[PDB]
Coordinates of C-alpha atoms and ligand atoms in Angstrom, one line a residue:
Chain Y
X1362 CA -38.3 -106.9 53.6
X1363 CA -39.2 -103.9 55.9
X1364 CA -36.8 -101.2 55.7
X1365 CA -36.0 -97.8 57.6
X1366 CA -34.9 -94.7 55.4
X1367 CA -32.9 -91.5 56.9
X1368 CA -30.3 -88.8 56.1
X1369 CA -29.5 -91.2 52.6
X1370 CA -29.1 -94.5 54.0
X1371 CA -31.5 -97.1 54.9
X1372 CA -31.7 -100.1 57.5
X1373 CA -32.2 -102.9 56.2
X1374 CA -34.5 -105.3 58.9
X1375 CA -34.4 -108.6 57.3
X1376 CA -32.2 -109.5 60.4
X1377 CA -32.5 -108.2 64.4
X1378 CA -30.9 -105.4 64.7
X1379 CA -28.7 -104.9 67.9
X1380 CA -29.3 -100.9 69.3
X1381 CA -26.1 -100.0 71.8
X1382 CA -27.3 -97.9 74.5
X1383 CA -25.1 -94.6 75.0
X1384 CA -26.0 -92.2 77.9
X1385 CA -24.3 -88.6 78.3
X1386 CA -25.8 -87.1 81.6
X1387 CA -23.2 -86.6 84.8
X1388 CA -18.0 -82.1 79.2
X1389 CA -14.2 -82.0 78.4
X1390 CA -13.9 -86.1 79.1
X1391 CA -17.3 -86.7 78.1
X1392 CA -16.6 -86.8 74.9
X1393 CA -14.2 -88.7 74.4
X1394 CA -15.0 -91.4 76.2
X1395 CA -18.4 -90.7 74.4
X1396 CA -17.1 -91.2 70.9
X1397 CA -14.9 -94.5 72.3
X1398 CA -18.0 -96.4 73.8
X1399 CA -20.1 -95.9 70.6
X1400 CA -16.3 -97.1 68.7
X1401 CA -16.6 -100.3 71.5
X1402 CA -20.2 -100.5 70.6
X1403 CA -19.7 -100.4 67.2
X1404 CA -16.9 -103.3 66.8
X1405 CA -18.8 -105.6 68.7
X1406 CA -22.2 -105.2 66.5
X1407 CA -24.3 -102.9 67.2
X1408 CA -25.8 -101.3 63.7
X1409 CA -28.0 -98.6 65.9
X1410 CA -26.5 -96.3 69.1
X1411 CA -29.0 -94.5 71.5
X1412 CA -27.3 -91.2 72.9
X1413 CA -29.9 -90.1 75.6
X1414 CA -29.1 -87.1 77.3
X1415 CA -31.6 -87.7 80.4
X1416 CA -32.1 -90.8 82.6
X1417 CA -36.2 -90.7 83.4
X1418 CA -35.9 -94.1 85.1
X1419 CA -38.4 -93.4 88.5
X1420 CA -36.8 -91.3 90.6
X1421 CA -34.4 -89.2 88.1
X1422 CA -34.1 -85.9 87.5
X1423 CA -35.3 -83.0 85.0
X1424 CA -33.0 -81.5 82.4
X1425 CA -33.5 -77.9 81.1
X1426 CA -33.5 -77.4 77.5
X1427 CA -30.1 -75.7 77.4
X1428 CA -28.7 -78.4 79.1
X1429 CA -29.6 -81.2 76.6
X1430 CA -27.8 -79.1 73.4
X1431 CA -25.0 -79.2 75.2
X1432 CA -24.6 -82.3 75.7
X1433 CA -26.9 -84.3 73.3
X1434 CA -25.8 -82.9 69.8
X1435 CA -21.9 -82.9 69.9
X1436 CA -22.4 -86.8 70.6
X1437 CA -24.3 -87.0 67.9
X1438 CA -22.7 -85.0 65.5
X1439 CA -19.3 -86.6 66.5
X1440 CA -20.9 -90.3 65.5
X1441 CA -22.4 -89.5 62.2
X1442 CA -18.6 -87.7 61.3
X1443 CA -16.6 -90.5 61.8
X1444 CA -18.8 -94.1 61.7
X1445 CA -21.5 -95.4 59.8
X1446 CA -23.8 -96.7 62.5
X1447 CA -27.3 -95.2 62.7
X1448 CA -27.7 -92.7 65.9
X1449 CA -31.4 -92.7 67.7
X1450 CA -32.1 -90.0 70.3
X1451 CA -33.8 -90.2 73.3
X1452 CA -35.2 -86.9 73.3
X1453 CA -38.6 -85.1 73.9
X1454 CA -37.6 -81.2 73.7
X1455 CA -38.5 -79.9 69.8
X1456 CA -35.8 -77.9 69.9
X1457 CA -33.1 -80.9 70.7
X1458 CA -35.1 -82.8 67.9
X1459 CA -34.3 -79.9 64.9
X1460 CA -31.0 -80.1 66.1
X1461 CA -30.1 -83.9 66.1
X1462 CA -31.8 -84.5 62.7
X1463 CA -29.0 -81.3 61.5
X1464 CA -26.0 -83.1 62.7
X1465 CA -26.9 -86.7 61.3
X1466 CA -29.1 -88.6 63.2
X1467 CA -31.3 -91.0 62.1
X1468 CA -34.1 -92.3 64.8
X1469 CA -36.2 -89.8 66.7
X1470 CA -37.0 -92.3 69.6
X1471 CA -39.2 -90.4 72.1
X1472 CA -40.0 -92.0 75.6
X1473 CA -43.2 -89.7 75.7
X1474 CA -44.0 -90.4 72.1
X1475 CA -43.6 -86.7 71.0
X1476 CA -46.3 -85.5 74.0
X1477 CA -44.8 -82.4 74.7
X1478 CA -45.6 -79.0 73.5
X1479 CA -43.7 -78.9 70.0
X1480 CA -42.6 -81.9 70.2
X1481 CA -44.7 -83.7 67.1
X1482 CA -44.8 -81.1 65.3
X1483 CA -41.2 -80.9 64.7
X1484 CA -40.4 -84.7 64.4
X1485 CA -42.4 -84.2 61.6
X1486 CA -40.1 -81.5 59.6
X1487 CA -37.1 -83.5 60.0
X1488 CA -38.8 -86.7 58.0
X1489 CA -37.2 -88.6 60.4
X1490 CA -38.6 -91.9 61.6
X1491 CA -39.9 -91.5 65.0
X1492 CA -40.2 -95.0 67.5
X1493 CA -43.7 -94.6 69.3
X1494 CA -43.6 -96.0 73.0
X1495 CA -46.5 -97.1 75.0
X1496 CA -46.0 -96.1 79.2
X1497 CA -48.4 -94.9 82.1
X1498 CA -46.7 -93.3 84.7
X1499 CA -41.0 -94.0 91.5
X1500 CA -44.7 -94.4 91.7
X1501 CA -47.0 -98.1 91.6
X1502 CA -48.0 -99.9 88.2
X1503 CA -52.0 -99.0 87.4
X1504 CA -54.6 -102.1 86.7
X1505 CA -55.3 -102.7 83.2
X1506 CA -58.8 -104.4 81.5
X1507 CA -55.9 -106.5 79.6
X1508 CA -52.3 -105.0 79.2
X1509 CA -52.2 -106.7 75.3
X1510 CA -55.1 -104.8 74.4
X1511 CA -54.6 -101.2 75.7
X1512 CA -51.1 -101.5 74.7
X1513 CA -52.6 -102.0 70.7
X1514 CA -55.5 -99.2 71.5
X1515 CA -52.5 -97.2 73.0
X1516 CA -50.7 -97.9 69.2
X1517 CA -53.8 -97.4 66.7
X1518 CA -54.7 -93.9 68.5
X1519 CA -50.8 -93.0 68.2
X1520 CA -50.4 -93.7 64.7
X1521 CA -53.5 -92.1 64.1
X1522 CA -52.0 -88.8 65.4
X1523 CA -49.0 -89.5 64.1
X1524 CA -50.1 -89.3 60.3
X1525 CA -52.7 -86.4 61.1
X1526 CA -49.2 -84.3 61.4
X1527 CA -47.8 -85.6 58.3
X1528 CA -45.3 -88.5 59.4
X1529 CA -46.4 -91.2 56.9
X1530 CA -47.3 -94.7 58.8
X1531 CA -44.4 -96.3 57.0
X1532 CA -41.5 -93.8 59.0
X1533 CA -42.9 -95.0 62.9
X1534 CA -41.5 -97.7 65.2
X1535 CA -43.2 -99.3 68.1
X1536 CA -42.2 -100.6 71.4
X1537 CA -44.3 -102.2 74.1
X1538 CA -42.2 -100.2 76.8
X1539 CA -40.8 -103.0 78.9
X1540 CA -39.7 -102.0 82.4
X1541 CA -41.4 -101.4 85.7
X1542 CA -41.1 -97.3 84.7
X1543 CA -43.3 -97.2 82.3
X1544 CA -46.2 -98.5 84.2
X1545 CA -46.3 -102.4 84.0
X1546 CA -45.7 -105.0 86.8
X1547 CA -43.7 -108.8 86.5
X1548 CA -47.2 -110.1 85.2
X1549 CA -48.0 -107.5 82.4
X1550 CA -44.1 -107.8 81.3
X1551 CA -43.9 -111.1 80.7
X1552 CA -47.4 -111.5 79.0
X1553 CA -46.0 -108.8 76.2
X1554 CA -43.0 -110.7 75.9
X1555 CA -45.2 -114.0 75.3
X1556 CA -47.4 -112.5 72.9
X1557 CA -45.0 -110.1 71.0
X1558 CA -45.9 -111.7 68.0
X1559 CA -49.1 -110.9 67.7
X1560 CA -48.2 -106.5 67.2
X1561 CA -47.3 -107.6 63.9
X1562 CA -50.4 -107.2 62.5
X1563 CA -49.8 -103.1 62.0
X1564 CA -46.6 -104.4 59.6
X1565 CA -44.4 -102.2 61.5
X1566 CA -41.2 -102.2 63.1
X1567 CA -40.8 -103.9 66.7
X1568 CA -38.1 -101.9 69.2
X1569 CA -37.7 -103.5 71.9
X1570 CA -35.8 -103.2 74.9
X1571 CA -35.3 -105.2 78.6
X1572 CA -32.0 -105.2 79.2
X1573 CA -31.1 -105.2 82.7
X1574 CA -34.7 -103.9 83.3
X1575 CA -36.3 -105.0 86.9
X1576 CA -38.7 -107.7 84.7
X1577 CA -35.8 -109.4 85.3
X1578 CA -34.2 -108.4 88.4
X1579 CA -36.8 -109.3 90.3
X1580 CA -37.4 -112.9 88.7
X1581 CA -34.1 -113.8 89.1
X1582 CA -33.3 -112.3 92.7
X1583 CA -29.8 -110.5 91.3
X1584 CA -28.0 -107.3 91.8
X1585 CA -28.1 -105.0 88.7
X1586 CA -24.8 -106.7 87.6
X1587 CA -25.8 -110.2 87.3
X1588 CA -28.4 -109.3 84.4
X1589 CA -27.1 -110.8 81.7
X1590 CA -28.0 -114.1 80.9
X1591 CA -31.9 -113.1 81.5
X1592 CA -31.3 -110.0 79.7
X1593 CA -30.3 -112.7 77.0
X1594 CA -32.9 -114.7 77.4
X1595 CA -35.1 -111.8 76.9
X1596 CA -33.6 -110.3 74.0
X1597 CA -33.8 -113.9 72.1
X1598 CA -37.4 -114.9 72.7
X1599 CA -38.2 -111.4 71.3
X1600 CA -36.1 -111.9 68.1
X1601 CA -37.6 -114.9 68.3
X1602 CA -40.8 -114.0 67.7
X1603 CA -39.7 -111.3 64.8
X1604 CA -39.1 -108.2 66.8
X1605 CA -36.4 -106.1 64.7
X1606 CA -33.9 -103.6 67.2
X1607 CA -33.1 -104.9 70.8
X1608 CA -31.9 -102.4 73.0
X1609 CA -29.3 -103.8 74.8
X1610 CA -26.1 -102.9 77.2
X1611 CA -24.0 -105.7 76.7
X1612 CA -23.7 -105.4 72.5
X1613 CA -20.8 -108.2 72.2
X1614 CA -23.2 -110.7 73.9
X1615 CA -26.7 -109.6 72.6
X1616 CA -25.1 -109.6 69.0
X1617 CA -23.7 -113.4 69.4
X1618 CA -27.0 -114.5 70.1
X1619 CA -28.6 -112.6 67.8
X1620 CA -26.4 -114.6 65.2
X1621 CA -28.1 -117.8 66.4
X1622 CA -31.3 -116.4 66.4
X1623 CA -30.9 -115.4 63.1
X1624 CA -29.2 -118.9 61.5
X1625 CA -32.4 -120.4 63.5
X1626 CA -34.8 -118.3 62.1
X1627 CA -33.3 -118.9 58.3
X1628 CA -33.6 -122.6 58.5
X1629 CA -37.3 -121.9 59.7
X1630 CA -40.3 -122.2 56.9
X1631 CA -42.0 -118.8 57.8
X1632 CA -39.4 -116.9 59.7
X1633 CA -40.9 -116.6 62.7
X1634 CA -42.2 -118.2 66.3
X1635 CA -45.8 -117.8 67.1
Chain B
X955 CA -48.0 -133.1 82.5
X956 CA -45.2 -135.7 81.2
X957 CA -43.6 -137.4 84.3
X958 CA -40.2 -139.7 84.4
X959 CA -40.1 -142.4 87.2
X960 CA -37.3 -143.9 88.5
X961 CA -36.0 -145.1 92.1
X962 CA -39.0 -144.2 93.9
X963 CA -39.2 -140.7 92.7
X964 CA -40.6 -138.4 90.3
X965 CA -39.2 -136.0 87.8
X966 CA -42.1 -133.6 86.9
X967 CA -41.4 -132.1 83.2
X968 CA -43.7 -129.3 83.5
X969 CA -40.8 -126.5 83.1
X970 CA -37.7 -127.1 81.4
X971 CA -34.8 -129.2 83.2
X972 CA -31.0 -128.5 83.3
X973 CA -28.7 -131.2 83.6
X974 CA -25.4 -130.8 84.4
X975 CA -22.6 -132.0 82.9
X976 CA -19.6 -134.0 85.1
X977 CA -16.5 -136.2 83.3
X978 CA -15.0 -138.2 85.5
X979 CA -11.5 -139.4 82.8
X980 CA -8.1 -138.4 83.3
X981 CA -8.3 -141.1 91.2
X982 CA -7.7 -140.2 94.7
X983 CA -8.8 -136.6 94.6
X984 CA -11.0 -137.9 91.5
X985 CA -14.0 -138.0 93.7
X986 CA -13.9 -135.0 95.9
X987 CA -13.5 -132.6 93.1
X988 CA -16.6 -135.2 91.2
X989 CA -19.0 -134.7 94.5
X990 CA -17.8 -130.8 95.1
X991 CA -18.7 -129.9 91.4
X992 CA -22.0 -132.0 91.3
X993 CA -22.6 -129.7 94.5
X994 CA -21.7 -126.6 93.2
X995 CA -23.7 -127.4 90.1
X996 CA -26.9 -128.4 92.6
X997 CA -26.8 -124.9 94.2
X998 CA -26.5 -123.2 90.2
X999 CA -30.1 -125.2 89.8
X1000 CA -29.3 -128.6 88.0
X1001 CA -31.8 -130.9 88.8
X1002 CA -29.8 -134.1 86.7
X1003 CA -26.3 -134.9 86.7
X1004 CA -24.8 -137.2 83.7
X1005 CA -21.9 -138.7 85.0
X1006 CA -20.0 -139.9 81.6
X1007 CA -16.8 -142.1 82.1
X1008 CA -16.4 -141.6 78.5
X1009 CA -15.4 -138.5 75.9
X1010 CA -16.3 -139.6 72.5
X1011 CA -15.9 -136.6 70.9
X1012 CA -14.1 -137.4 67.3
X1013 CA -10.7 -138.4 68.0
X1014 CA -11.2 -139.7 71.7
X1015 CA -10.0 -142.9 73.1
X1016 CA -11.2 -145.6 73.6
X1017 CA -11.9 -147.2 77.5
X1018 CA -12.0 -151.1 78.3
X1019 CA -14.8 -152.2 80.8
X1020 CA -12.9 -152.1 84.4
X1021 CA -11.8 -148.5 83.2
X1022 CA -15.5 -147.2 83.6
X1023 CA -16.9 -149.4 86.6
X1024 CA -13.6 -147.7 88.3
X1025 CA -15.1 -144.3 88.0
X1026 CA -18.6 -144.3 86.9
X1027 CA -19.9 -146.1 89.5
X1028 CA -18.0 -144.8 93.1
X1029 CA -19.1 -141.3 91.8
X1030 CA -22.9 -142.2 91.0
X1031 CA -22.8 -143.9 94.2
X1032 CA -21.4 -140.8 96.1
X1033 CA -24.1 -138.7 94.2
X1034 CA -27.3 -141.0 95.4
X1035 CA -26.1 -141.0 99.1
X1036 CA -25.7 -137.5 99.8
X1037 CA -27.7 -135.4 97.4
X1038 CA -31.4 -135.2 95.8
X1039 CA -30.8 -134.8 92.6
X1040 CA -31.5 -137.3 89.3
X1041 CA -28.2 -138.5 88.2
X1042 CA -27.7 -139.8 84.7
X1043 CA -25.5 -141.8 83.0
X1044 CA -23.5 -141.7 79.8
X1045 CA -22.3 -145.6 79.4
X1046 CA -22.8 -147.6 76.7
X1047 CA -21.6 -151.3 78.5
X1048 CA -23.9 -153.5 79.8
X1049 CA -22.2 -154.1 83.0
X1050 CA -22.0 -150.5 83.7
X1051 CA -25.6 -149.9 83.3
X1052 CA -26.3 -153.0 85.8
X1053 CA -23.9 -151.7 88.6
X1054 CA -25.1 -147.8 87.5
X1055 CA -29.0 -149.0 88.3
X1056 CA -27.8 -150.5 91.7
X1057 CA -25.9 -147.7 93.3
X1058 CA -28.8 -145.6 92.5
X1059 CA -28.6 -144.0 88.7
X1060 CA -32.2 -142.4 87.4
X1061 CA -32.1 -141.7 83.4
X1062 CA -30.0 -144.6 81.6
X1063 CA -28.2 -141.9 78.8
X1064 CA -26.5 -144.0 76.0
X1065 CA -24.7 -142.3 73.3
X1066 CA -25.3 -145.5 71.2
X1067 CA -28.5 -145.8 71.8
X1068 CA -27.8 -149.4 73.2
X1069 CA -26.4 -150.8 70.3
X1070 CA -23.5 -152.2 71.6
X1071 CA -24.0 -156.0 72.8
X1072 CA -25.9 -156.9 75.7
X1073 CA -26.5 -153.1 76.2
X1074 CA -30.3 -152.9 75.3
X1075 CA -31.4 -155.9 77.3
X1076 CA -29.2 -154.4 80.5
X1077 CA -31.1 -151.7 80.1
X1078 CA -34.6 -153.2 80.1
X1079 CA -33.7 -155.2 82.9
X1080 CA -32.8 -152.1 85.2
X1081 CA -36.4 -150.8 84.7
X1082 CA -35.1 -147.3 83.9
X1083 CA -35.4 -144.5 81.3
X1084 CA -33.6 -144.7 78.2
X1085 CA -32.6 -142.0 76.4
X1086 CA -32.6 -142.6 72.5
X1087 CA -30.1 -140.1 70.4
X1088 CA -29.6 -139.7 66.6
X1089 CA -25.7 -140.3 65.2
X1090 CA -24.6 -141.2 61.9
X1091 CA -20.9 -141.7 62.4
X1092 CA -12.9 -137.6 63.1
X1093 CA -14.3 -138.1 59.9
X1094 CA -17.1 -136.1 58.2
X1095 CA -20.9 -135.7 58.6
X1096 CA -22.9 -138.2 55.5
X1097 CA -25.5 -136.3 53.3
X1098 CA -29.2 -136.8 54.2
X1099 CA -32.7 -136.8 52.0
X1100 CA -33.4 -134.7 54.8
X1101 CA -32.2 -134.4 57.9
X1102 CA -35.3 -134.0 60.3
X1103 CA -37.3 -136.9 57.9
X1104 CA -34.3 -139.7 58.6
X1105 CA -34.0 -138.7 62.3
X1106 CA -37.6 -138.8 62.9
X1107 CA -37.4 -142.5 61.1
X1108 CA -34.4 -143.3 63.3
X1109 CA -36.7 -142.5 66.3
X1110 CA -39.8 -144.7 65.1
X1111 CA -37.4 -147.3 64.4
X1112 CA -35.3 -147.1 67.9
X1113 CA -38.4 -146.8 69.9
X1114 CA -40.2 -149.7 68.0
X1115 CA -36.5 -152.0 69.0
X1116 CA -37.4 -150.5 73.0
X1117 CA -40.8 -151.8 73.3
X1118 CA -39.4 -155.6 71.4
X1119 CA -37.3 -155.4 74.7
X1120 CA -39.4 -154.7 77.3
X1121 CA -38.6 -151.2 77.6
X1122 CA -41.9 -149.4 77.8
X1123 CA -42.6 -146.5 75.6
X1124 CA -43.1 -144.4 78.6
X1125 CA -39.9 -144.4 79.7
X1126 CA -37.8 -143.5 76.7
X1127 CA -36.2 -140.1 76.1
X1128 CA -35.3 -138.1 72.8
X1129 CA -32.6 -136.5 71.7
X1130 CA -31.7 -135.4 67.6
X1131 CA -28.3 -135.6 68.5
X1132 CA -26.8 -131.6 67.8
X1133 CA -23.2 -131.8 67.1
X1134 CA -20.6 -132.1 64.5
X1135 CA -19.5 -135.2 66.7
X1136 CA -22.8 -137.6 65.4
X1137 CA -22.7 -136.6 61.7
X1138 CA -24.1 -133.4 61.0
X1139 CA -23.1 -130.3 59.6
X1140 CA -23.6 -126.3 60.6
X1141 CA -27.0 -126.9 58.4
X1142 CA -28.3 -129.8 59.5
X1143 CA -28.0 -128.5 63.5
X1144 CA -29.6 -125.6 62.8
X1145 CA -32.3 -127.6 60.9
X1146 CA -32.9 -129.4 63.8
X1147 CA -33.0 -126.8 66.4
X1148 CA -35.5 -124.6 64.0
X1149 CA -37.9 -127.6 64.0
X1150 CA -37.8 -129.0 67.3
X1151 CA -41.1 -128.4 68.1
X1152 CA -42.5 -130.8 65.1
X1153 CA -40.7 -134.0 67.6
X1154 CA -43.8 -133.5 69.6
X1155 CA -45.7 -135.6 67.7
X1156 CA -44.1 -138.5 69.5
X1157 CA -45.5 -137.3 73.0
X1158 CA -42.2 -138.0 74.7
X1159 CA -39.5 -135.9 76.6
X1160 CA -37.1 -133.9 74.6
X1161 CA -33.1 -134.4 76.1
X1162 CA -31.5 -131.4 74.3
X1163 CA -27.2 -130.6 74.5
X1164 CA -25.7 -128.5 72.4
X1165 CA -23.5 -126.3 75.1
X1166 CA -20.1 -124.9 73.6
X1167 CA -20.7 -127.4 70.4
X1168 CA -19.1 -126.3 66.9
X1169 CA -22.7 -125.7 66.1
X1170 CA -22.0 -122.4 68.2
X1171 CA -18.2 -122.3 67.5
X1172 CA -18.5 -121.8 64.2
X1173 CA -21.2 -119.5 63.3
X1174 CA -19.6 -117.2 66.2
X1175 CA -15.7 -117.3 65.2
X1176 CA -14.7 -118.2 68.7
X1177 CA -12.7 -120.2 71.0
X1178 CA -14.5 -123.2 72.9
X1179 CA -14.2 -120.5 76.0
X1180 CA -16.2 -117.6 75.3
X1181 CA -19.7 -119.6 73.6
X1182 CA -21.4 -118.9 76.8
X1183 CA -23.8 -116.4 75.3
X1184 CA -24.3 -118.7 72.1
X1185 CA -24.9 -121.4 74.2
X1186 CA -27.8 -119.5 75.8
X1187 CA -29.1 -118.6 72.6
X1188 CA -29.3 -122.0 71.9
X1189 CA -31.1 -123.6 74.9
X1190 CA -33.5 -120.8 75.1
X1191 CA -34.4 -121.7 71.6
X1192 CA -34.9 -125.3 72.3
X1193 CA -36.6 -124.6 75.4
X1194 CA -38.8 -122.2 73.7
X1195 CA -40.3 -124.9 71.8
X1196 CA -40.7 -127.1 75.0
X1197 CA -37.6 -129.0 75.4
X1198 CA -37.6 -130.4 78.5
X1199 CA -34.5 -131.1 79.6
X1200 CA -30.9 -129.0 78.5
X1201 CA -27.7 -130.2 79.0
X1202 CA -25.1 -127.6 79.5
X1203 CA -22.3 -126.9 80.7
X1204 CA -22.9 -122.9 82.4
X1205 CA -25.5 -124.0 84.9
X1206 CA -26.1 -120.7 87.0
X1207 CA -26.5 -119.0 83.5
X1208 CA -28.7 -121.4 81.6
X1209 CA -31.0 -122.0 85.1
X1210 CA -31.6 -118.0 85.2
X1211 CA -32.4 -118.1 81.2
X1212 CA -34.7 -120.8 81.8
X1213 CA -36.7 -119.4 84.5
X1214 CA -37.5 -116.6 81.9
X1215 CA -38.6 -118.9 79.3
X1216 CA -40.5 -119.9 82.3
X1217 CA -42.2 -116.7 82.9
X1218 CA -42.5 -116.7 79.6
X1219 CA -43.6 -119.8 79.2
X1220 CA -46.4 -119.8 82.0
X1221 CA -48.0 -116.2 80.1
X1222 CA -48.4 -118.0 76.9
X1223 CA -51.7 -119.6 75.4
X1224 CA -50.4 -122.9 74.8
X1225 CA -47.3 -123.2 76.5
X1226 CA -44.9 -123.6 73.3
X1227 CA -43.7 -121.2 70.4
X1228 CA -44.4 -122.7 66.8
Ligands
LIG808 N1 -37.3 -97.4 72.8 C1 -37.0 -97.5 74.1 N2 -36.4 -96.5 74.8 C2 -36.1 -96.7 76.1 N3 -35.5 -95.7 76.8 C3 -35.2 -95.8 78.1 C4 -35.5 -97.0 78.8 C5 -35.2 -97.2 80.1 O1 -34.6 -96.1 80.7 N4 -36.1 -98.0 78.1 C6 -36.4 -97.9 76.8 C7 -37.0 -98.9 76.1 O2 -37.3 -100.0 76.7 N5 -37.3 -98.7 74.8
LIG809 N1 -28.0 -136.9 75.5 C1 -26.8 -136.3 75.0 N2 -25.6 -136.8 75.4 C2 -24.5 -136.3 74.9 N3 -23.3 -136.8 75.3 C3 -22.1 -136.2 74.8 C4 -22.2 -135.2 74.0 C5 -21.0 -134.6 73.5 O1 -19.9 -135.2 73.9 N4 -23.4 -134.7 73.6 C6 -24.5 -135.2 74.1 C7 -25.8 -134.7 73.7 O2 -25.8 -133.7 72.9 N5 -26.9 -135.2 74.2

């Protein structure tokens, strides 16, 4: 019954939504190759594509602002030209957020939840529904009171700034920020996938994404490569439990299970696992 | 807490259980390709084994007596002596489940739900666990009043003809029966795997198989080769609301799912999803 709204379409998340993740960081081959993994993408499910033009995983990098038009915007503008899918950005630069929402793009998906200077104030100009992400800080995972309940404080004080810059409450996303980057160890993982749930009570959208992330890496004592049955796993006791977009690498996989999920959850009385 | 006895050891049901799947039809090599897969399955995780001397999917042959003593009982026997495991078996002839019980079989697994003569009193004689499954009937699956209400009253019924036997109540297994092999349809599977949970009620262990079944097949479009992620779907579902053992075919992939229903699992209030 909850839907998403951009650039004259909407998203329709009666059913979990598969979200393709595209990165363009190290331009002539770049982009093709961009444009025929988002096609790949595209033909095996996924209904949303994430073209991030920096890797912030511990350890990575900084990009200059120049460095992100270049690279972020033709992808994007190439995928809203030629396919129908919906195209987030992982962005946090105000300037690479006017310029996405220009060429088409539908999600503004921050990993700082619009903290930098500018940053807010233009992801509310383009109208654009903006995915709020809750994170901390190659460095150690702080000690939290309870992870559940600063993660919802975290929420209520960011959707409280959200609306004081004029992005209505019904235009945000949320996302717990799985992942060993963000500032959460095994333990405070796995107790926000067991009581994912529960963040329903703000009647929101539920992004989520653990694929390949170390929450399971580390359980399961595998190489990066070997991911993907707990990445599965994952991604299904979170649809489980109602959340809406997984954001996934292996799409063909991710969106075959998200067919079971979904035949499950239609046979179920109240549509969801508590 | 629930606990299965047999041979003079324990199975402890406290976290979900995959058993393994070996078919041992059409035997010189027969056995030391039977042994090396039980062993490879052993180092993907499997903790049972259910040696079946029998495929009954619709349109399968039929096998006279001496056919399965041939081959059910050398490779039981081979499993007992050298490896730890539980190993169960899928026979539905009383002499077969006598000779099974004295070369050292744990779980008693009878696609008939000992209904064949002399079957049922074998199998109270042995002192084993039973497992009880659900089947109706190549043909088609029958229409129910409803398919969970006449399954549950098959179980109240099957487990009231154990314990007129000698068979303890203790010692019997579940299992609805998933597969459009035992007379249900794409609906009525998904019926039963959206309200698994409600079998509780009986305070017994929950057997649960439906790897690579037409239940997954069909909803998927794909060949009986590449329903691995479907599969997982599936058996994290079940084991999501506490199934306690899954049989499957994929060990290595359904043993590193599990452990993240585990972790899941473990994080949780009450140790099952509703
Ligand atoms: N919304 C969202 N965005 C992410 N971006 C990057 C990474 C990891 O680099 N993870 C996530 C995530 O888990 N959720
Ligand atoms: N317990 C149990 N046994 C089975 N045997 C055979 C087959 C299919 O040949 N399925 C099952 C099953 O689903 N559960």
């Amino acid at each position: 019954g909850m839907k998403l709204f951009a650039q004259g379409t909407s998203l329709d998340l009666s059913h979990p939504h598969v979200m393709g993740i595209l990165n363009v960081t190290p331009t002539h081959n770049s982009l093709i190759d961009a444009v025929k993994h988002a096609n790949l993408m595209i033909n095996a499910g996924a209904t949303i594509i994430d073209v991030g033009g920096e890797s912030t995983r511990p350890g990575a990098a900084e990009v200059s602002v120049e460095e992100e038009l270049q690279r972020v915007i033709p992808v994007v503008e190439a995928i809203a030209q030629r396919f129908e899918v919906w195209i987030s950005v992982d962005t946090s630069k105000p300037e690479v957020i006017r310029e996405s929402a220009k060429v088409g793009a539908h999600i503004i998906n921050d990993i700082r939840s619009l903290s930098e200077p500018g940053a807010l104030e233009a992801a509310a100009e383009t109208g654009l529904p903006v995915c709020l992400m809750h994170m901390q800080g190659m460095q150690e995972a702080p000690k939290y009171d309870d992870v559940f309940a600063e993660v919802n404080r975290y929420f209520i004080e960011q959707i409280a700034r959200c609306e004081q810059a004029g992005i209505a409450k019904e235009k945000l996303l949320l996302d717990p920020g799985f992942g060993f980057g963000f500032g959460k160890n095994l333990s405070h993982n796995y107790s926000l996938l067991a009581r994912l749930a529960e963040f329903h009570h703000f009647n929101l959208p539920l992004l989520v994404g653990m694929s390949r992330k170390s929450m399971i890496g580390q359980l399961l004592n595998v190489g990066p490569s070997e991911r993907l049955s707990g990445s599965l796993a994952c991604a299904v006791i979170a649809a489980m439990q109602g959340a809406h977009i997984i954001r996934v690498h292996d799409v063909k996989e991710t969106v075959e299970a998200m067919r079971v999920v979904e035949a499950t959850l239609s046979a179920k009385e109240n549509k969801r696992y508590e």
